[PDB]
Amino acid sequence: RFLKVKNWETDVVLTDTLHLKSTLETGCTEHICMGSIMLPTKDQLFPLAKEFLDQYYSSIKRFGSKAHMDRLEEVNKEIESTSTYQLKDTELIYGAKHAWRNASRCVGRIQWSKLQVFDARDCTTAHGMFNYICNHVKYATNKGNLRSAITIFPQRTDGKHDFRVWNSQLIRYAGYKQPDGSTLGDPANVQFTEICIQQGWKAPRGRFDVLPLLLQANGNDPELFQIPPELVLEVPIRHPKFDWFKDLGLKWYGLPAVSNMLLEIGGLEFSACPFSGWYMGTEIGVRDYCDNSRYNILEEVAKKMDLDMRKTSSLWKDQALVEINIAVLYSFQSDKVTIVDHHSATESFIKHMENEYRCRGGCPADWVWIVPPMSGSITPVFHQEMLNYRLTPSFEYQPDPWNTHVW
Amino acid sequence: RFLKVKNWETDVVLTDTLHLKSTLETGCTEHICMGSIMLPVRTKDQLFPLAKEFLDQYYSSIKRFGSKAHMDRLEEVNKEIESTSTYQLKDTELIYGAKHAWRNASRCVGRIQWSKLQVFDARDCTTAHGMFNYICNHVKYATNKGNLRSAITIFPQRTDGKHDFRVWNSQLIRYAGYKQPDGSTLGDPANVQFTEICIQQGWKAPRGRFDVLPLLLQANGNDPELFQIPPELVLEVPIRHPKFDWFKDLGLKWYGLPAVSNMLLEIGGLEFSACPFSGWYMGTEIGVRDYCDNSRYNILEEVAKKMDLDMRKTSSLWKDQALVEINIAVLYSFQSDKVTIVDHHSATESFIKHMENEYRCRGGCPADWVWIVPPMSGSITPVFHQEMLNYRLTPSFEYQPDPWNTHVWKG
Numbered sequence: 050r051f052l053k054v055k056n057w058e059t060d061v062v063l064t065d066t067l068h069l070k071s072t073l074e075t076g077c078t079e080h081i082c083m084g085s086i087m088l089p090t091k092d093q094l095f096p097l098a099k100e101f102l103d104q105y106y107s108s109i110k111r112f113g114s115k116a117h118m119d120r121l122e123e124v125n126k127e128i129e130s131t132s133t134y135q136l137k138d139t140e141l142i143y144g145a146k147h148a149w150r151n152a153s154r155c156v157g158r159i160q161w162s163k164l165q166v167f168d169a170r171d172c173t174t175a176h177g178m179f180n181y182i183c184n185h186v187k188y189a190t191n192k193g194n195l196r197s198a199i200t201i202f203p204q205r206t207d208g209k210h211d212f213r214v215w216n217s218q219l220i221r222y223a224g225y226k227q228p229d230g231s232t233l234g235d236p237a238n239v240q241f242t243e244i245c246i247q248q249g250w251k252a253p254r255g256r257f258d259v260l261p262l263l264l265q266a267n268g269n270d271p272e273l274f275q276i277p278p279e280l281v282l283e284v285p286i287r288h289p290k291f292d293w294f295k296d297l298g299l300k301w302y303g304l305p306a307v308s309n310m311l312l313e314i315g316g317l318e319f320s321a322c323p324f325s326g327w328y329m330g331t332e333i334g335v336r337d338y339c340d341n342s343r344y345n346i347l348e349e350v351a352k353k354m355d356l357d358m359r360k361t362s363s364l365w366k367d368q369a370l371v372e373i374n375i376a377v378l379y380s381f382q383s384d385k386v387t388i389v390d391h392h393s394a395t396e397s398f399i400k401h402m403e404n405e406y407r408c409r410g411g412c413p414a415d416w417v418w419i420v421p422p423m424s425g426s427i428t429p430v431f432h433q434e435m436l437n438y439r440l441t442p443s444f445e446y447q448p449d450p451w452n453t454h455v456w
Numbered sequence: 457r458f459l460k461v462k463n464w465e466t467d468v469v470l471t472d473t474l475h476l477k478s479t480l481e482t483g484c485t486e487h488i489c490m491g492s493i494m495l496p497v498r499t500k501d502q503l504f505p506l507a508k509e510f511l512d513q514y515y516s517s518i519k520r521f522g523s524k525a526h527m528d529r530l531e532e533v534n535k536e537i538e539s540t541s542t543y544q545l546k547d548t549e550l551i552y553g554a555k556h557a558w559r560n561a562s563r564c565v566g567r568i569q570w571s572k573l574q575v576f577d578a579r580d581c582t583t584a585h586g587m588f589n590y591i592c593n594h595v596k597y598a599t600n601k602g603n604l605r606s607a608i609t610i611f612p613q614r615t616d617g618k619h620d621f622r623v624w625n626s627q628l629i630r631y632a633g634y635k636q637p638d639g640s641t642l643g644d645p646a647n648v649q650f651t652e653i654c655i656q657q658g659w660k661a662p663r664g665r666f667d668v669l670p671l672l673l674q675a676n677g678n679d680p681e682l683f684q685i686p687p688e689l690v691l692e693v694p695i696r697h698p699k700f701d702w703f704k705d706l707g708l709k710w711y712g713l714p715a716v717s718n719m720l721l722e723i724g725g726l727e728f729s730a731c732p733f734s735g736w737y738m739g740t741e742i743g744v745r746d747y748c749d750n751s752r753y754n755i756l757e758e759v760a761k762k763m764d765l766d767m768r769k770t771s772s773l774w775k776d777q778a779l780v781e782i783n784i785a786v787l788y789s790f791q792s793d794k795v796t797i798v799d800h801h802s803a804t805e806s807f808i809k810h811m812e813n814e815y816r817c818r819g820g821c822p823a824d825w826v827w828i829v830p831p832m833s834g835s836i837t838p839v840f841h842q843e844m845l846n847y848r849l850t851p852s853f854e855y856q857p858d859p860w861n862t863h864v865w866k867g
């Protein structure tokens with residue numbers, strides 16, 4: 050029940066004690082590991098609140114202090130009275146940072162503690178949402194020198210009045226199916242686009258149309274806003290060696306911002322909580338450009354590179370893949386927009402895991418997501434055993450709102 | 457229960473009813489997933505159920521379930537266990553056993569081939585010299601002049617665990633490593649220790665970068681003995697690259713026969729602690745792991761130097777660039793000398809056809825994604841987007857400790 054993790058390349062062995070705080074379940078049993086599956090009231094609330102405050106007061110070394118107890122007392126009163134409660138700003142700051150610290154699929158967590166947190170708990174309408182979201186965008190892009198940030202909309206109440214951002218990220222390109230059979234744009238967003246167009250968006254019908262935001266406040270029908278165009282920094286993609294690369298007309302956006310998750314602190318659920326960091330090159334070059342279901346540009350690139358695409362064992366896919374990724378890192382670097390390569394990212398997460406082991410006694414990590422999708426074994430996370438578990442505060446998945454919102 | 461696995465590339469959803477036979481355990485709990493953890497003397501008591509289970513499987517598979525012959529064999533085994541404490545498998549059972557151990561190997565990407573396995577029955581083997589001979593025949597039949605065939609040789613089963621047959625090498629064919637006084641390593645770092653054991657047992661080491669190891673063979677729980685494979689039996693391929701003429705001048709070669717010699721084959725509760733098996737290589741095993749782990753031959757820097765990539769910035773992706781070249785060189789050299797090899801695109805596509813089949817025919821295919829996904833270019837191979845359920849069926853291949861840690865020396 051105290052578990053060791055070994056690195057098979059360095060023979061370093063660490064002991065995890067933190068897992069023994071796991072609360073949420075994994076999907077796995079003694080009989081069957083589910084590690085590669087992408088998606089598996091007053092009395093419930095007080096214990097959730099208690100565990101949180103307890104860890105909070107711990108973290109500021111006033112555990113068991115009058116300040117501590119009083120707080121527990123007050124929150125307890127408040128749940129009993131109001132059946133919910135409100136987080137102090139400091140507690141909210143700490144909750145958000147720790148939900149990131151606990152994000153076991155996130156390779157970028159060495160940064161966890163620098164997070165800029167923006168409290169949008171006073172917001173009441175969709176327009177107020179849009180304004181808060183634009184400031185977050187601007188702050189975070191910071192003219193290409195990206196900074197971490199999260200904006201936190203009012204917490205859930207009776208679940209009739211949810212704040213949600215319908216977009217799955219703040220910035221993403223539209224998807225249009227053609228009378229042709231094929232797909233113009235990002236095939237990931239075809240459905241969501243049908244919903245913007247339903248709700249009224251006048252689609253430019255291009256390959257790289259920034260999607261409008263779709264904001265729902267206080268359980269209301271969501272409404273549409275376009276992000277100021279001048280607030281969306283974009284990078285045209287070129288290759289340091291192939292002059293013809295730019296001719297593919299590719300660009301990607303600089304700010305990666307996840308806008309569909311649910312942040313749970315001390316038992317309260319912030320169902321609208323967009324957060325943003327900066328990209329690892331492979332998110333774009335491998336997944337975004339290369340996944341069959343996405344922009345799918347491998348075949349077109351190999352063909353410019355004049356590779357023998359006649360058989361798989363020439364490795365022409367692997368060739369073209371490396372180049373597309375060279376091209377991405379080089380284009381962000383030339384435009385001075387922050388981007389991290391997968392060597393550098395994983396190198397730093399290994400340091401991060403060691404501090405977490407040293408100073409926390411563990412670090413939850415999901416090897417399936419931590420290891421980059423190209424050149425796995427030449428990054429150090431490959432050789433690193435990781436234990437995956439769920440600690441709270443946490444980011445959780447939640448059902449897409451078009452499935453559940455009634456109008 | 458049914459369980460569904462989705463493919464994210466294709467939206468195909470599959471259903472697994474097979475995990476319902478999984479008896480062994482995973483290491484996972486609902487509070488922790490140990491899916492990336494490398495490592496997850498038996499009484500009559502336990503044995504009969506294991507025998508019966510196995511034999512129900514065998515008999516169902518031959519469409520003879522509940523037949524007299526089925527029942528009589530149950531009976532026979534039963535009595536053999538009570539009077540002798542163990543039992544002996546029929547040939548056809550040892551054959552179905554070893555086919556299924558492979559079929560159930562969830563870390564093996566090569567399983568579309570599970571039914572074409574040549575099983576050599578070395579159960580009458582009684583000495584170390586007997587083992588050498590059996591193994592030499594395995595290498596030669598498996599190598600088949602470069603047109604590789606799958607094979608496994610199966611020495612007698614454990615009895616009281618004091619008399620175990622064991623091949624101390626971890627693969628039948630593999631290169632010496634030597635630690636030097638200066639800290640450096642000559643040849644394959646992975647095998648320094650076992651190399652030190654052989655030197656100690658009396659091997660006279662060439663001390664080269666590519667010395668084939670001797671076999672170290674334990675029969676009947678006796679101390680084990682050294683044997684040189686006949687060099688003429690050991691196929692090797694010099695590595696050259698189809699455009700880079702300086703690639704050959706790196707001095708690389710690799711052997712053609714990949715053969716796992718350290719696992720434990722379990723059938724109907726019996727335990728075969730010496731059961732060398734071999735297949736053919738997937739290119740990445742050599743050109744990614746063997747050549748490019750830092751803890752292995754580690755030729756990355758040297759290849760990138762020769763390609764004269766920008767190496768001052770890891771974001772030039774110089775490592776990724778040399779990685780692709782080294783792997784093209786491996787697939788290229790093997791194909792040129794006509795030695796069987798499969799690339800990772802071809803290997804993983806085959807496996808996904810296999811795995812779908814298995815869901816239709818069998819109702820499942822235990823698979824371990826951490827292992828099944830290749831170690832370069834993960835996402836552009838169709839396994840990456842395939843959700844997989846990992847679980848343990850028998851018959852099966854297990855890990856066993858290294859014999860040097862457990863062997864009781866006779867002297």
Ligand code: HEM
Pocket residue numbers: 149152154155156157158160164197198199307324325326327328329332389394418444
């Ligand atoms: C600082 C720069 C950051 C980097 C380089 C980074 C890196 C990554 C990567 C590569 C993933 C995998 C996502 C995928 O492949 O689909 C990921 C997921 C995630 N990251 Fe980050 N991240 C960063 C900042 C943040 C911040 C600021 C937060 C929250 C405050 C966060 C929380 C998460 C979470 C919850 C996931 C899981 C997403 C999911 O389940 O789809 N990350 N991160």
Ligand code: HEM
Pocket residue numbers: 554557558561563564565566567569573606607608733734735736737738741798803827853
């Ligand atoms: C026919 C060609 C074959 C191919 C291409 C193939 C491919 C592979 C690969 C790439 C691995 C992962 C090895 C590693 O990364 O360390 C593997 C593992 C394995 N294969 Fe195969 N294999 C083949 C034949 C066989 C055969 C004939 C058997 C048994 C009869 C077998 C049983 C296994 C087992 C048990 C593992 C797990 C390895 C371990 O746990 O260390 N394979 N296979």
Ligand SMILES: Fc1cccc(CCNCCc2ccnc(-n3ccnc3)n2)c1
Pocket residue numbers: 155157218305306307324325326327
């Ligand atoms: F194709 C899919 C279907 C369902 C879920 C999924 C995973 C999405 N994971 C978030 C991807 C993403 C995008 C932008 N930014 C981040 N991000 C930023 C900081 N940390 C993560 N992450 C993929």
Ligand SMILES: Fc1cccc(CCNCCc2ccnc(-n3ccnc3)n2)c1
Pocket residue numbers: 564566627714715716733734735736
């Ligand atoms: F460094 C390590 C410590 C423990 C296990 C490990 C993986 C070894 N896996 C067997 C590798 C291997 C070698 C030759 N041939 C096969 N092979 C042949 C058919 N199927 C697999 N497999 C590495």
Ligand SMILES: C[C@H](O)[C@H](O)[C@H]1CNc2nc(N)[nH]c(=O)c2N1
Pocket residue numbers: 084085086087417418419464840841842843844
């Ligand atoms: C099926 C498999 O879990 C799935 O495709 C995984 C693989 N690895 C991943 N890795 C990251 N970083 N993000 C992902 O969404 C996934 N998806």
Ligand SMILES: C[C@H](O)[C@H](O)[C@H]1CNc2nc(N)[nH]c(=O)c2N1
Pocket residue numbers: 057431432433434492493494826827828829
């Ligand atoms: C620590 C981690 O489990 C280790 O690197 C695993 C990952 N995936 C692997 N995949 C294969 N095919 N072979 C391996 O040895 C490993 N090693």
Ligand SMILES: [Zn+2]
Pocket residue numbers: 077081082083084484488489490491
């Ligand atoms: Zn698991």
